[PDB]
Amino acid sequence: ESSFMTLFPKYRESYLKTIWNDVTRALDKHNIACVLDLVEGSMTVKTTRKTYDPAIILKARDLIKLLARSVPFPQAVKILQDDMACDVIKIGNFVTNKERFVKRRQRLVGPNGNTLKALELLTKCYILVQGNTVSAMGPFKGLKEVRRVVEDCMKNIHPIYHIKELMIKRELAKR
Amino acid sequence: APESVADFERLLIGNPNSSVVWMNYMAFQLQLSEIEKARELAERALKTINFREEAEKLNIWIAMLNLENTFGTEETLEEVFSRACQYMDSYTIHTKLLGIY
Amino acid sequence: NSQVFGVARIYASFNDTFVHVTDLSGKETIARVTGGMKVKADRDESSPYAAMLAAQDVAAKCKEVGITAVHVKIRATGGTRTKTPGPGGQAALRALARSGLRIGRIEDVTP
Amino acid sequence: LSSESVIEQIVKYARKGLTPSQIGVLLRDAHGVTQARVITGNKIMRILKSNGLAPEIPEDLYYLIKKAVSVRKHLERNRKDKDAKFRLILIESRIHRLARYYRTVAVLPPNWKYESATASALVN
RNA sequence: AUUAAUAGGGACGGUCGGGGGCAUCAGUAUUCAAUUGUCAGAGGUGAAAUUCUUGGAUUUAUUGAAGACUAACUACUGCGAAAGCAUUUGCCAAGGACGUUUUCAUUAAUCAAGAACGAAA
């Protein structure tokens, strides 16, 4: 039937194997077939005829990619609920060489993780930087600022422009 | 003028970078109904001329194509086309070919 | 079982929810029920609750015509867009399943 | 092992149309010999010069002067070959220092004037 | 012929690279056109506005034409003189590391002047 597959690096599969038995313990509650292909290093979210709706497989397919993007499986666990949707942004096509790509990588993170946690307190999302992705998960009116911050900061734009608009909109919130 | 088999060949020792002699020699060779000595001449003037002369080198591919325009073949003018497309520019020989066609 | 089925294209994008379940061939969709038609504020087009209200009409027009099953070809934006599945997926596809319409060999077939 | 016979093997090998490294690579592969510096007591290029089998240009230079003219053929195929012309500016500095060695160490005269124009005449 | 700087050129052979020039074929993604089913919205926004819309906006599917790039695999991975660099495969020429009791014996080190490549517009 349905199947959505995602490949993983070496960093999360060992972290998956402590939770993939819990993933199959949790996917069985919605009757979804989860594969732990240790030979392939990939997981596939498959549908079953004992399930209610096929939409929860794709919501777990975002959770399986969140499980494969070195985000926590507890942090990927809330995606199966209604009012929490993820945003697995690929930011690979920004700079070819590793020099200027790593220049904007820490600038989207900041010194001691303050600026990466700043957008977490600005746009209300779980920002997860692992490898060449910037994954977020939250309300879409807050998550619209997440894709606006992630797509422009891999270019020559800094997060100081993003946070200052976010600090102004948060201050005029209570009115 | 150079009108013999020995005449235009002697000028090649004095004028190596001159394809204009082979441009008249290919008019002097294929006029005797044997263009195999004229197709040899455009092949010889490629390996005899200096590589720094681009005005005669691209014209050498334009000479063997315009000779191929009336007195050539179907795939022989195209095999000389993709040989000029590797040794020289693509569309500048094709804009020459658009004027030739 | 008799396989009274078509194909269901649900556009669960980031800005709206458009549902156009097609036939066994790609043309001649028997149903086309928008999410912004069942809620009139121009802001609830991406809401799944308006998409769940829209999904009752989506099951209705096929059950009126004769398609008792629908295989889901789910759609996010894809391509040169945000490429991720939005909010309108988990409610609109479930309400077709809550209406007894048989799901089987479902897919996400966006760009 | 009859020391002059390795020279008589070289006297046919230098007459076989090969470089001095080619006589040293072949004799060390199929004849057991170590080098020209071995007990026979004569250099590979100097024994070829002593019997009239030496070349016209230096073997250090003539394989580099040929490599300067041959690499210009790809640059004659594309003037946008920005690395092959960069290799051509470098390799023409490799043969120029070689001929400047022979001009001072009296293997070539100081009026030779090595140029990439006539280097196709000294490669063939 | 004082030695063959565990200096250097040059030569062989096993390797390798997202190197570059050319070519090969493969890949998704986009626009426009031909056209069917159907519409009260579609897009955009914090809420709107703006934009197209029984001129069918909009969704699906199909065909044609054109332009760009190699996501996940894929990374502190190698390479390119630097700039820069990712489908399959080749042509041509260039290159890191390799071993020779292979060849030369300083041919070798920094570069004003002066010239070549070349990041944005």
From Swiss-Prot, chain A:
Domain KH, first and last residues per copy: 85-155
Keywords recorded for this protein, A-Z: Nucleus, Ribonucleoprotein, Ribosome biogenesis, RNA-binding, rRNA processing
Residues spanning the membrane: none
Disulfide pairings: none
Keyword GTP-binding set for record: no
GO terms under biological process: rRNA processing
Primary location recorded for the protein, binned into one broad class: nucleus
Protein's cellular compartments: Nucleus, Nucleolus
GO molecular function: RNA binding
Lineage top rank: taxon: Eukaryota
Record-level GO cellular component terms: nucleolus; small-subunit processome
Summary of the function given for this chain in its UniProt record: Required for 40S ribosome biogenesis. Involved in nucleolar processing of pre-18S ribosomal RNA and ribosome assembly. Essential for vegetative growth.
Family, per entry: Belongs to the KRR1 family.
Subunit structure as annotated in this protein's UniProt entry: Component of the ribosomal small subunit (SSU) processome composed of at least 40 protein subunits and snoRNA U3. Interacts with snoRNA U3. Interacts with MPP10, KRI1 and with ribosomal proteins RPS1A, RPS4A, RPS4B, RPS8A, RPS8B, RPS11A, RPS11B, RPS13, RPS24, RPS25, RPL4A, RPL7B, RPL8, RPL23, RPL25 and RPL28.
Protein name: KRR1 small subunit processome component
Species this protein is from: Saccharomyces cerevisiae (strain RM11-1a)
Curated annotation (Swiss-Prot), chain B:
Top-level taxon of origin: Eukaryota
Ranges: HAT repeats: 1-31
Cell location: Nucleus, Nucleolus
Function text: Involved in the biogenesis of rRNA. Required for the formation of 18S and 5.8S rRNA.
Record's miscellaneous remark: Present with 8860 molecules/cell in log phase SD medium.
Subunit structure: Interacts with snoRNA U3. Interacts with MPP10. Component of the ribosomal small subunit (SSU) processome composed of at least 40 protein subunits and snoRNA U3.
Protein name: rRNA biogenesis protein RRP5
Span covered, complete protein: 1457 to 1557 of 1729
From Swiss-Prot, chain C:
Record protein name field: Small ribosomal subunit protein uS11A
Gene Ontology molecular function terms on file: mRNA binding; structural constituent of ribosome
Gene name as annotated: RPS14A
Superkingdom per UniProt: Eukaryota
Subunit description: Component of the small ribosomal subunit (SSU). Mature yeast ribosomes consist of a small (40S) and a large (60S) subunit. The 40S small subunit contains 1 molecule of ribosomal RNA (18S rRNA) and 33 different proteins (encoded by 57 genes). The large 60S subunit contains 3 rRNA molecules (25S, 5.8S and 5S rRNA) and 46 different proteins (encoded by 81 genes). uS11 interacts with eS1 forming part of the mRNA exit tunnel. uS11 interacts with snoRNA U3. uS11 interacts with MPP10. Component of the ribosomal small subunit (SSU) processome composed of at least 40 protein subunits and snoRNA U3.
Keyword Nucleotide-binding set for record: no
One GO-annotated biological process of the protein: ribosomal small subunit assembly
Family assignment from sequence similarity: Belongs to the universal ribosomal protein uS11 family.
The species this protein was found in: Saccharomyces cerevisiae (strain ATCC 204508 / S288c)
Post-translational modification (record): N-terminally acetylated by acetyltransferase NatA.
Miscellaneous: Present with 29600 molecules/cell in log phase SD medium. There are 2 genes for uS11 in yeast.
UniProt keyword annotations, A-Z: Acetylation, Cytoplasm, Nucleus, Ribonucleoprotein, Ribosomal protein, Ribosome biogenesis, rRNA processing
Compartment(s): Cytoplasm; Nucleus, Nucleolus
Keyword NAD assigned: no
GO cellular component entries: 90S preribosome; cytosol; cytosolic small ribosomal subunit; nucleolus; nucleoplasm; small-subunit processome
From Swiss-Prot, chain D:
Highest taxon listed in the record's lineage: Eukaryota
Cross-link (Glycyl lysine isopeptide (Lys-Gly) (interchain with G-Cter in ubiquitin)): K12, K16
Phosphoserine carried by residues: S5
Signal peptide interval: none
Coiled coil: none
GO molecular-function term, one example from the UniProt record: small ribosomal subunit rRNA binding
Cellular component aspect of the GO annotation: 90S preribosome; cytoplasm; cytosol; cytosolic small ribosomal subunit; nucleolus
Keyword Mitochondrion: no
Keywords from the named record: Cytoplasm, Isopeptide bond, Phosphoprotein, Ribonucleoprotein, Ribosomal protein, Ubl conjugation
Family indicated by similarity: Belongs to the universal ribosomal protein uS15 family.
Function, in words: Component of the ribosome, a large ribonucleoprotein complex responsible for the synthesis of proteins in the cell. The small ribosomal subunit (SSU) binds messenger RNAs (mRNAs) and translates the encoded message by selecting cognate aminoacyl-transfer RNA (tRNA) molecules. The large subunit (LSU) contains the ribosomal catalytic site termed the peptidyl transferase center (PTC), which catalyzes the formation of peptide bonds, thereby polymerizing the amino acids delivered by tRNAs into a polypeptide chain.
Binding partners and assembly: Component of the small ribosomal subunit (SSU). Mature yeast ribosomes consist of a small (40S) and a large (60S) subunit. The 40S small subunit contains 1 molecule of ribosomal RNA (18S rRNA) and 33 different proteins (encoded by 57 genes). The large 60S subunit contains 3 rRNA molecules (25S, 5.8S and 5S rRNA) and 46 different proteins (encoded by 81 genes).
Record's protein name: Small ribosomal subunit protein uS15
Gene: RPS13
